[PDB]
């Protein structure tokens with residue numbers, strides 16, 4: 001259906017801004033922040049029918065989610081939170097909400113020029129992570 005075509009591919013992190021403060025807001029402890037902040041993940045996005053798969057491969061952790069838009073699922077995040085996630089498309093932006101322990105964070109993924117831009121928000125704190133084609 002050509003849903004999410006422009007996201008599909010293999011992407012490499014090239015910049016991160018304010019990720020330490022985002023992780024602090026999420027509740028990540030010191031050692032995980034330091035090590036996770038160093039990581040330069042490879043994000044691999046694929047689509048098969050209605051199922052979107054996003055993998056993240058790095059020195060810190062290899063993670064993978066598969067999902068159908070609008071349909072809640074279980075995700076264990078790289079920092080080991082057990083969250084309930086729902087991902088939708090809003091005007092061409094993938095919007096991913098994670099719920100756990102009465103908390104919530106929202107991750108947006110957008111195509112901007114030749115980049116895939118990831119915006120991570122926890123209360124008033126945003127981090128921006130920019131990926132390029134690998």
Ligand SMILES: O=C(O)c1cccc(OCc2ccccc2)c1OCc1ccccc1
Pocket residue numbers: 023026028036037039041043056058060061077078079107118120129
């Ligand atoms: O860049 C991504 O694709 C990404 C998208 C949404 C949330 C993420 O981190 C959540 C998070 C919250 C709290 C702690 C770590 C990660 C992400 O980094 C994963 C990551 C980061 C570092 C190392 C490996 C993988």
